[PDB]
Design a protein around this ligand. Sequence first.
Ligand SMILES: CCOc1cccc(-c2nnc(N)s2)c1
Ligand SMILES: *[C@@H]1O[C@H](CO)[C@@H](O)[C@H](O)[C@H]1NC(C)=O
Length: 341
Amino acid sequence: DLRLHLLLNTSVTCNDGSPAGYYLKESRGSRRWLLFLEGGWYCFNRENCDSRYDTMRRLMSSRDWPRTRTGTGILSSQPEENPYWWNANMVFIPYCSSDVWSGASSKSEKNEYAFMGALIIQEVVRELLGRGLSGAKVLLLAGSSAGGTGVLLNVDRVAEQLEKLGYPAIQVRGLADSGWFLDNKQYRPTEAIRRGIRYWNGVVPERCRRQFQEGEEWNCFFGYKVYPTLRSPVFVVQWLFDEAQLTVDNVHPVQEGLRLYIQNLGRELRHTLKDVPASFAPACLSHEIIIRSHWTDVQVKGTSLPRALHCWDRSLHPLKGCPVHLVDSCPWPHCNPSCPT
Ligand SMILES: CCOc1cccc(-c2nnc(N)s2)c1
Ligand SMILES: *[C@@H]1O[C@H](CO)[C@@H](O)[C@H](O)[C@H]1NC(C)=O
């Protein structure tokens, strides 16, 4: 169980002005820290944010949050559930900003909602330094779905923040799960992200912003475009046939047209990962994995995800029998026998 702490700086808020926060389980004998970003889509104007507030309110407010949460998957402390980092200090950061963790805008007389995702991450890091993070050797910023995209948008800013605060020896790294999307042709959101950035006062990494420039910052929400601009090591986990990708593409006895569409999506995803040295991409139809209790079950080329992450750790000190780049080559969902049922 991880215990809730609401942020002492009450100007850093969820969508409705209530305080943001984090859940924490400390491990006194460890210098590794795992900060996980929750996912859950986003909203991009007054009307669809109002709808979200009616029936997805825990993603917009802390008023009804429970005081504890059970750590699962990579946030579990049991070695049998989490062979990778079971003895680490564990942090779960709830997603209550509806902005893919990019926003920097307060609620005010002209803004019905606050969008403070980028500032929530910075404030969590600041307040954790007084609770033991000042002694860390590695800070892994991880996340799933919108939280995986949030890793890509924020990992280098966390590294810069710790450098400027006088902690140049903490190694900052990223783990992006199910946040690597393609701005492809639909079978039957670039615009929704463009509108969202203006609504949220969204911020993107500096080098990516300089490449694409004003009005085109939406490009930096797409992994294959923002990843080459990053300096921190990032490990990319992505199902080749991601369900959120297919939903946006308007895909739901498969005939030739849809067969070719689905095979081309897998091929394109594989192509964007060809030069990503730390990656895990199985040929499955699914969505998210790293905080699932059965995350230990899937394998690519005989290597599990916890093993690949451990091999990544060793590489940051090629390794015999300890691979870090694992991408399936077979071209149809569930051609990998270990896919989630
Ligand atoms: C942060 C990006 O989020 C997503 C997620 C899933 C799909 C898409 C898109 N698909 N087709 C497009 N033209 S954009 C974007
Ligand atoms: C509180 O958070 C706001 C928003 O990021 C920031 O401008 C301010 O400096 C913070 N105050 C303190 C005391 O940390």
